């Protein structure tokens, strides 16, 4: 054992040892510490070669051309670059953008800014199960719609949108389609040679890579074009200027090479635990699953418990390191699903990972049963519910 | 970010339960204050001719909110009708060392005890 | 010895061992790998505390309030944030910006973009010594000038602009003043409590920290305000959204704590070498110093050799890892100084550092003497010069 | 990014120097081509009645540009006036394995030899 039990892999994941020891060789004076931009000597070249390896490692995992891989500082920057770059590029065709109310902040806040820049954004409401209704997406599309952004796996509830089907719809009407795939990379399979996705964002620290490094897939064929948001030398094919963080990039490339291998088995193991977990608590009187057990990420499970206050719940689960629908504002995701503020407040996001064990899932199962029945004993609302 | 006393009272709340609302010895007041959407039910039973015999509570909110009403039931035992009447939220906050944010838990706790008292006085009749 | 000799510290510096071993403790599952944003458990807290330590370490080195420290991905992003954020904020007062033609690309390219956004930029030409004439800066200032950006130490020639004097001029006319201090941090002393500088950019990998991490000083008093360019949660006091790269930040904080100590002696040592180097080559017939030996950075030395072609020079110096005035474009810095394309082409930027030795400086001195006299023997231009 | 042969010729250029421009045996042509701003001076002295005795060069440009004119002086030795006349840049580029970018070094090398020849023919008179 070892308390508290880390069940917050969706917030961040621990850098796999293999990822780290590879990074070390690109830092100190005796390692490969050079600047790839230095195109005039050995140091810059050796760094440059390591960069390419990683760029390919990342590309192979998603079935893309390494040239389509643009390096950023993380999924946040990627999301910003993707939606801002394209919107400013294809603005002459139109200024209307479509997206899901449940999108990660990096996307929503970007659209809020764009709105105040003159663009028009349509935030779509998802069904009670989090799934987006494609009929509604279609109705929202107009001749001047230029960009659509729907994420693969959701970071709060782990629901999986049919990005493939959406890609078709978009391509069909000639609309740029962006996918925040940060929670799905290395978990769910991705092949950009099949997928009609124009822009995709990944980070590393969600799949056991280092923080502060990400990538942005920009389709080469049919060519998708974006306006750089980071100027100063026109690096990354003039899409993202700035020195390439080699040791950080190596880290990513390596974590992606590992993902490609162990993703198959690992993801089905997590699915067994997640199921186990829900099994052990689904019988509790008024618990609510947020998302879709069937069609949802295998590593994320978000549930809402009725008649107990959000904060008192978190406190009761001192032994666990999870996340919640609290922040002076409940989770906007859970409220876009059609949960009232109270039910939204009292939600726990269990996120499993590499180090999770059946042993721990069992401990949590009991811990949750214990806490809820106890807090409900203190609850005067529970009583009123219990009797009329 | 919680204080030690709050942890104590949250993890071991004193006087959980409820009284018969027609006990004649009992004055019950259930006050909530949507603004954060909490709600605590406190109620007493008085030693006929003034002094307070016993009280009980149930609550829904932070550990602070809980520890708040817990403390109050504890303080009220052995008190008078009026002694408990002049408790004042501020004192409850000082005791529990509540941060500015969770100050509303005191105000509410005070509301609760005062409301329970008023209920007792109203029934006689 | 050990060839080739690394004289390109201005491109990047090797992560000091102490910096690295501190970073390692914030990566793996047994270290402090948590997300600072996770405000609900131990993991997020421990990471959060380490972040603060580093934020202060950085602040103490420059004499600033840690709250004035905004984290970025590097000096490029900082430069972008600084100039873009303020320009979009204070745009109602005016749309005119002033800057030096010799500024790093991260600044210039930013201003090119802004120009196409509706702003008006005045690129000032420096004197033959690289120093900016303050009289000219002043003449350029108008009632609608809102921002001025002049860098401390120049990255190509190492000239030092009197940022203090400029700060006064700006504050006096109520103009926001930004300083790209990336080449000067941990080398030249900086105290923002004395300096009238409103915005300052630093990175880490120029002073032996990890790449892909930087900071942006935003003055608190008198309050300077900027519009965030990276949206998604309003982190860094709503100026820079995105997960804080802990291990990267720790790296910076640690490299800055080290700088504060060893900067004093180290910088005067480098000055001795740089002098030694120039000593050994200043006697060569037609060599030209770019910058100001007196008033210039102690670690940078950029010289132009006449009558030899740029590329042939670089090739001759196979044994050294330096940088040059080549890229289909000579160095714009050296051409803004008033050097013709040929003299600009054939320039070498020697940048010294932690590991540089007198032994190596001597080797370079002879190597340069050897090469130049040899290439001049092949030069038909040299002959025409030699005889009428 | 340079080829082995280029390195050889750059680091050990063959036939560096210059001839007397009034040698009567010598035809000298100095051609440059601002466009990259290089310049190479090549000149020969001919074995009266056709064949070429010896040549010499000086140049200013890349290692490629240098190796280019170096090679040419080497090739021209023992050649004829016309044999050397039909050298063609392409052949020079193939030999040195020049990348698309440094192709201008061939064109120039050819220019140089052709210009030197023309100079010899012009003086006789
Ligand atoms: C965590 C997360 C992000 C943020 O990306 P960083 O690389 O952490 O800046 C963006 N999108 C999703 C879906 C995420 O889960
Ligand atoms: C290297 C450099 C930069 C770039 O900053 P990174 O942190 O490398 O992105 C900016 N300004 C100056 C003066 C530099 O020397």
Residue numbers in the entry:
A (entry chain B), C (entry chain B): 1 to 327, 333 to 393
B (entry chain A), D (entry chain A): 2 to 126
Copied sentences from the primary study:
IscS is a highly conserved, widely distributed pyridoxal-5′-phosphate (PLP)-dependent enzyme, with 60% sequence identity between the enzyme from Escherichia coli and its human homolog, NFS1. It initiates intracellular sulfur trafficking, delivering the sulfur to several sulfur-accepting proteins such as IscU, ThiI, TusA, and MoaD/MoeB that commit the sulfur to different metabolic pathways, including iron-sulfur cluster assembly, thiamine and biotin synthesis, tRNA modifications, or molybdopterin biosynthesis. The small domain (residues 1–15 and 264–404) contains the critical active site cysteine Cys328.
IscU is a two-layered α/β sandwich with a core three-stranded β-sheet and bundle of five α-helices. IscU makes contacts with helix α8IscS (Glu309-Ala316), helical turn α10IscS (Glu347), the end of helix α11IscS, and the C-terminal helix α12IscS (Arg379-Lys391). The bound IscU projects its most conserved surface containing three conserved cysteines toward the IscS loop that carries Cys328. The distance between the modeled Cys328IscS and any cysteine of IscU in our structure is greater than ∼12 Å, implying that a conformational change must accompany sulfur transfer. Each IscU molecule interacts with only one subunit of the IscS dimer and, based on its orientation in the complex, would be expected to accept sulfur from the same subunit to which it is bound. Since most regions of IscS show no differences in the various crystal structures, either alone or complexed with acceptor proteins, and in view of the high flexibility/disorder of the Cys328 loop, we postulate that it is this loop that bends closer toward IscU in order to effect sulfur transfer.
